[model samples]
Target: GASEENIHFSSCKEAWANGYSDIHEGEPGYSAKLDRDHDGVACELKN
Candidate 1:
């Protein structure tokens, strides 16, 4: 199962290392800091 609440990260790289690719608004660890594109998604996996 996924995390029940949002988690905080100092960097998007940290969030990615924790197994989070693309975090949505209500998903775990979702933060505006990670959303570089401002599309409501955070920590998006780099291509």
Candidate 2:
């Protein structure tokens, strides 16, 4: 059910621009590409 179609952003700026934060893993648009720190959370304001 999760895929890039949900959303794709390299930083919280993009996610937040779309009104999202703390985007969790496996959720739509949450990808390893976004998890720069690899802490399982993507599109977070902080790593």
Candidate 3:
């Protein structure tokens, strides 16, 4: 949980591993509504 945001994820891997796995990384609450791309992957750290 963050004081500056209300980001949510599907798993711990999605939460603290790489970064906010936002499917729509350009939206305001994209991270909060992770896996938006319907890829069944949430907050997947790309790097």
Residue pairs in steric clash, candidate 1?
A: 7-29
Candidate 3: 10-residue stretch with minimal lDDT:
23-32
Candidate 2 lDDT score at position 17: 86
Candidate topping lDDT: 1
Per-model TM-score, in order, reads: 0.60, 0.55, 0.27
lDDT of 2 by residue, 1-47 (tens): 43546555666667778777777765754666676677777666655
What digit string (tens of lDDT, one per residue) describes model 1 on residues 1-47?
A: 66545566787787777788877667865655556567777777658
The TM-score ranking, best first, is: 1, 2, 3
> Per-residue lDDT for 1-47 in model 3, tens only?
34435544465454555454444444323443544564554455568
TM-score of 3: 0.27
Error of 3 at 44 (Å): 0.6
TM-score of 2: 0.55
- TM-score of candidate 1 on Cα atoms, chains taken together: 0.60
